[PDB]
Amino acid sequence: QRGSPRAEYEVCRLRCQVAERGVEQQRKCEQVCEERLREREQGRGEDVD
């Protein structure tokens, strides 16, 4: 499936919160996923959502 963007976003963060508990690592985790979300939200086409 396509999935829910925010769920994937949260999973992205969750992985780091549980597995890699480092400040900058976890920062990068959510930041790199958030910038992906930017392209997602600035580029919704006929996705149907």
Side-chain angles (χ1 to χ4, degrees), residues 2-49:
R2 183 174 64 216
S4 308
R6 300 184 300 209
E8 301 182 273
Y9 173 86
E10 290 293 88
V11 176
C12 168
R13 306 179 59 220
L14 183 66
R15 301 189 304 195
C16 301
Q17 296 178 210
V18 181
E20 304 186 89
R21 62 191 67 204
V23 59
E24 297 305 299
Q25 293 302 271
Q26 299 177 331
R27 298 303 77 232
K28 296 181 174 183
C29 297
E30 51 183 71
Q31 292 175 30
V32 175
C33 290
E34 186 277 288
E35 54 180 80
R36 185 189 68 215
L37 271 288
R38 300 178 188 178
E39 299 184 82
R40 172 65 290 201
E41 303 298 67
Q42 294 178 30
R44 297 181 178 195
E46 292 187 79
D47 286 83
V48 180
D49 184 82

XYZ file of all heavy atoms in Angstrom, unseen atoms left out:
403
model
N 0.828 -1.197 0.000
C 0.000 0.000 0.000
C 0.865 1.251 0.000
O 2.100 1.156 -0.056
C -0.840 -0.067 1.263
C -0.636 -1.458 1.831
C 0.364 -2.090 0.873
N 0.245 2.404 0.027
C 0.976 3.657 0.041
C 1.345 4.020 1.470
O 2.460 4.480 1.740
C 0.163 4.777 -0.624
C 0.889 6.116 -0.710
C 0.084 7.139 -1.497
N -1.194 7.481 -0.849
C -2.341 7.744 -1.504
N -2.403 7.608 -2.829
N -3.422 8.131 -0.825
N 0.422 3.797 2.375
C 0.669 4.063 3.750
C 0.288 5.456 4.134
O 0.033 6.314 3.272
N 0.240 5.682 5.394
C -0.057 6.962 5.941
C 1.273 7.690 6.193
O 2.115 7.196 6.956
C -0.824 6.756 7.237
O -1.928 5.887 7.017
N 1.488 8.862 5.548
C 2.760 9.604 5.614
C 3.216 9.894 7.032
O 4.395 9.727 7.359
C 2.461 10.914 4.891
C 1.331 10.598 3.990
C 0.505 9.562 4.699
N 2.280 10.295 7.890
C 2.627 10.637 9.258
C 2.976 9.402 10.070
O 3.814 9.469 10.946
C 1.550 11.475 9.941
C 1.291 12.797 9.236
C 0.281 13.655 9.975
N -1.025 13.006 10.112
C -2.194 13.655 10.199
N -2.228 14.988 10.208
N -3.327 12.969 10.328
N 2.372 8.271 9.737
C 2.686 7.016 10.407
C 4.105 6.609 10.067
O 4.888 6.285 10.948
C 1.713 5.917 10.008
N 4.435 6.676 8.775
C 5.783 6.369 8.289
C 6.793 7.326 8.935
O 7.881 6.923 9.359
C 5.847 6.515 6.769
C 4.890 5.623 5.999
C 5.046 5.792 4.510
O 4.402 6.681 3.922
O 5.856 5.054 3.896
N 6.400 8.589 9.006
C 7.171 9.649 9.648
C 7.450 9.287 11.114
O 8.589 9.378 11.578
C 6.375 10.966 9.538
C 6.926 12.154 10.291
C 7.888 12.986 9.740
C 6.456 12.449 11.558
C 8.367 14.078 10.445
C 6.924 13.525 12.260
C 7.876 14.341 11.711
O 8.341 15.422 12.436
N 6.419 8.863 11.816
C 6.541 8.459 13.202
C 7.381 7.198 13.358
O 8.193 7.123 14.266
C 5.170 8.306 13.850
C 4.451 9.629 14.068
C 5.141 10.502 15.092
O 6.041 11.293 14.748
O 4.781 10.417 16.277
N 7.204 6.222 12.455
C 8.016 4.989 12.468
C 9.496 5.350 12.341
O 10.328 4.872 13.110
C 7.617 3.987 11.329
C 8.548 2.775 11.306
C 6.182 3.512 11.507
N 9.782 6.239 11.405
C 11.124 6.771 11.157
C 11.773 7.281 12.451
O 12.953 7.014 12.732
C 11.017 7.912 10.127
S 12.517 8.927 9.924
N 10.987 7.961 13.253
C 11.457 8.533 14.494
C 11.545 7.456 15.557
O 12.545 7.357 16.268
C 10.496 9.619 14.939
C 10.242 10.669 13.880
C 9.254 11.708 14.360
N 9.721 12.395 15.562
C 8.958 12.720 16.594
N 7.650 12.426 16.601
N 9.507 13.347 17.616
N 10.508 6.633 15.622
C 10.382 5.551 16.592
C 11.581 4.613 16.538
O 12.105 4.210 17.580
C 9.099 4.761 16.327
C 8.784 3.633 17.305
C 8.497 4.181 18.691
C 7.625 2.807 16.800
N 12.030 4.296 15.318
C 13.194 3.425 15.116
C 14.397 3.976 15.870
O 15.095 3.255 16.574
C 13.559 3.298 13.625
C 12.459 2.745 12.738
C 12.956 2.454 11.326
N 13.568 3.624 10.664
C 13.820 3.715 9.344
N 13.478 2.722 8.530
N 14.436 4.793 8.855
N 14.580 5.263 15.773
C 15.695 5.925 16.396
C 15.488 6.069 17.895
O 16.423 5.958 18.662
C 15.913 7.271 15.734
S 16.247 7.111 13.962
N 14.262 6.266 18.310
C 13.957 6.425 19.724
C 14.195 5.129 20.492
O 14.684 5.145 21.624
C 12.531 6.928 19.917
C 12.309 8.322 19.345
C 10.883 8.816 19.475
O 10.414 9.595 18.648
N 10.190 8.396 20.498
N 13.888 4.015 19.863
C 14.060 2.724 20.496
C 15.486 2.180 20.299
O 16.133 1.756 21.266
C 13.033 1.681 19.946
C 13.197 0.324 20.627
C 11.607 2.182 20.116
N 15.976 2.209 19.065
C 17.267 1.597 18.747
C 18.478 2.502 18.957
O 19.438 2.104 19.615
C 17.272 1.031 17.334
N 18.449 3.705 18.423
C 19.639 4.550 18.445
C 19.426 5.777 19.291
O 19.012 6.827 18.790
C 20.057 4.955 17.026
C 20.298 3.782 16.104
C 20.849 4.194 14.770
O 22.083 4.273 14.635
O 20.064 4.405 13.810
N 19.701 5.671 20.558
C 19.438 6.773 21.438
C 20.612 7.736 21.542
O 21.394 7.733 22.497
C 18.858 6.333 22.793
C 19.745 5.446 23.644
C 18.953 4.870 24.799
N 17.930 3.939 24.311
C 16.803 3.602 24.935
N 16.471 4.169 26.094
N 15.995 2.704 24.378
N 20.762 8.495 20.495
C 21.757 9.516 20.420
C 21.095 10.781 19.994
O 20.250 10.744 19.093
N 21.471 11.891 20.597
C 20.791 13.158 20.369
C 20.785 13.584 18.887
O 19.715 13.732 18.297
C 21.299 14.308 21.316
C 22.791 14.587 21.157
C 20.482 15.586 21.123
N 21.953 13.677 18.270
C 22.042 14.153 16.903
C 21.488 13.148 15.928
O 20.895 13.526 14.929
C 23.465 14.546 16.526
C 24.009 15.700 17.340
C 23.107 16.913 17.282
O 22.879 17.455 16.181
O 22.635 17.363 18.334
N 21.653 11.870 16.240
C 21.125 10.811 15.397
C 19.618 10.928 15.296
O 19.073 11.025 14.206
C 21.519 9.420 15.918
C 23.009 9.112 15.836
C 23.543 9.205 14.418
O 23.522 8.233 13.669
N 24.037 10.355 14.045
N 18.963 11.010 16.445
C 17.510 11.109 16.500
C 17.022 12.416 15.887
O 15.929 12.460 15.302
C 17.017 10.975 17.925
C 17.365 9.650 18.570
C 16.937 9.576 20.011
O 16.868 10.593 20.710
N 16.667 8.387 20.478
N 17.832 13.477 16.006
C 17.496 14.747 15.377
C 17.445 14.554 13.873
O 16.458 14.903 13.230
C 18.502 15.875 15.710
C 18.643 16.287 17.188
C 17.329 16.729 17.835
N 16.460 15.599 18.185
C 15.178 15.472 17.846
N 14.578 16.422 17.129
N 14.490 14.402 18.245
N 18.494 13.942 13.334
C 18.605 13.680 11.906
C 17.473 12.798 11.420
O 16.922 13.038 10.351
C 19.956 13.049 11.571
C 21.132 13.956 11.853
C 22.441 13.305 11.490
C 23.584 14.287 11.648
N 24.882 13.719 11.228
N 17.124 11.801 12.217
C 16.024 10.896 11.906
C 14.749 11.656 11.561
O 14.236 11.551 10.433
C 15.765 9.941 13.070
S 17.152 8.834 13.457
N 14.266 12.473 12.487
C 13.041 13.186 12.244
C 13.200 14.299 11.227
O 12.318 14.495 10.412
C 12.338 13.639 13.532
C 13.178 14.396 14.523
C 12.392 14.720 15.772
O 12.090 13.815 16.560
O 12.099 15.906 16.017
N 14.346 14.964 11.221
C 14.586 16.051 10.278
C 14.610 15.566 8.829
O 13.947 16.159 7.968
C 15.854 16.819 10.622
C 15.748 17.619 11.910
C 17.054 18.269 12.294
O 17.869 18.611 11.440
N 17.272 18.438 13.566
N 15.324 14.473 8.569
C 15.421 13.906 7.216
C 14.060 13.365 6.748
O 13.705 13.445 5.564
C 16.532 12.810 7.122
C 16.558 12.135 5.757
C 17.892 13.421 7.407
N 13.287 12.847 7.661
C 11.963 12.399 7.310
C 10.996 13.576 7.135
O 10.169 13.561 6.240
C 11.447 11.314 8.268
S 12.336 9.722 8.065
N 11.162 14.619 7.928
C 10.322 15.818 7.843
C 10.536 16.517 6.488
O 9.583 16.933 5.841
C 10.620 16.736 9.061
C 9.747 17.982 9.240
C 10.195 19.163 8.424
O 11.240 19.762 8.766
O 9.509 19.542 7.453
N 11.780 16.578 6.027
C 12.065 17.188 4.731
C 11.502 16.343 3.564
O 11.205 16.872 2.484
C 13.556 17.515 4.562
C 14.473 16.347 4.799
C 15.925 16.690 4.634
O 16.531 17.273 5.559
O 16.496 16.380 3.579
N 11.323 15.043 3.800
C 10.687 14.160 2.819
C 9.202 14.506 2.757
O 8.597 14.570 1.677
C 10.827 12.699 3.236
C 10.297 11.708 2.208
C 10.259 10.299 2.770
N 9.247 10.152 3.833
C 9.373 9.370 4.910
N 10.561 8.847 5.225
N 8.320 9.142 5.694
N 8.639 14.740 3.941
C 7.246 15.131 4.110
C 6.959 16.445 3.400
O 5.884 16.627 2.850
C 6.875 15.213 5.607
C 6.341 13.930 6.293
C 4.944 13.628 5.823
C 7.232 12.726 6.036
N 7.945 17.340 3.385
C 7.821 18.618 2.679
C 7.518 18.379 1.209
O 6.592 18.950 0.668
C 9.094 19.459 2.804
C 9.461 19.812 4.226
C 10.757 20.597 4.289
N 11.203 20.782 5.670
C 12.330 21.405 6.053
N 13.154 21.927 5.157
N 12.620 21.484 7.333
N 8.267 17.480 0.590
C 8.083 17.172 -0.827
C 6.767 16.443 -1.059
O 6.143 16.565 -2.113
C 9.243 16.349 -1.360
C 10.574 17.050 -1.252
C 11.686 16.265 -1.870
O 11.852 16.331 -3.102
O 12.434 15.591 -1.150
N 6.354 15.703 -0.065
C 5.104 14.996 -0.101
C 3.941 15.986 -0.105
O 3.060 15.911 -0.957
C 5.013 14.042 1.106
C 3.666 13.337 1.335
C 3.263 12.366 0.221
N 2.905 13.027 -1.050
C 2.156 12.477 -2.008
N 1.611 11.281 -1.826
N 1.946 13.124 -3.154
N 3.986 16.931 0.795
C 2.909 17.885 0.976
C 2.949 19.019 -0.045
O 1.923 19.621 -0.361
C 2.931 18.405 2.400
C 2.831 17.294 3.435
C 1.545 16.519 3.343
O 1.311 15.810 2.344
O 0.738 16.595 4.277
N 4.117 19.302 -0.574
C 4.245 20.307 -1.620
C 4.044 19.672 -2.981
O 4.073 20.358 -4.011
C 5.608 20.990 -1.589
C 5.884 21.841 -0.360
C 7.275 22.436 -0.405
O 7.815 22.698 -1.486
N 7.870 22.637 0.736
N 3.846 18.375 -2.989
C 3.682 17.665 -4.215
C 2.652 16.566 -4.121
O 2.966 15.396 -4.341
N 1.441 16.915 -3.740
C 0.345 15.971 -3.768
C -0.322 16.110 -5.114
O -0.750 17.219 -5.488
C -0.705 16.235 -2.670
C -0.240 16.109 -1.223
C -1.418 16.382 -0.294
N -1.111 16.234 1.140
C -2.044 16.136 2.111
N -3.328 16.072 1.799
N -1.683 16.088 3.379
N -0.393 15.044 -5.845
C -1.018 15.085 -7.143
C -2.352 14.429 -7.053
O -3.122 14.721 -6.132
N -2.655 13.549 -7.959
C -3.853 12.776 -7.825
C -3.552 11.531 -7.035
O -3.459 10.427 -7.572
C -4.511 12.438 -9.148
C -5.092 13.626 -9.870
C -5.861 13.204 -11.076
O -7.016 12.756 -10.924
O -5.324 13.277 -12.199
N -3.308 11.739 -5.773
C -2.994 10.665 -4.872
C -4.257 10.104 -4.301
O -4.392 8.892 -4.147
C -2.069 11.140 -3.736
C -0.638 11.381 -4.170
O -0.306 12.467 -4.705
O 0.209 10.489 -3.967
N -5.200 10.999 -4.061
C -6.473 10.706 -3.420
C -6.231 10.460 -1.947
O -5.906 9.337 -1.509
C -7.277 9.534 -4.070
C -8.598 9.311 -3.338
C -7.535 9.815 -5.546
N -6.298 11.526 -1.202
C -6.059 11.492 0.206
C -6.877 12.566 0.848
O -7.844 12.243 1.551
C -4.580 11.700 0.517
C -4.289 11.562 1.986
O -4.136 10.422 2.466
O -4.189 12.580 2.700
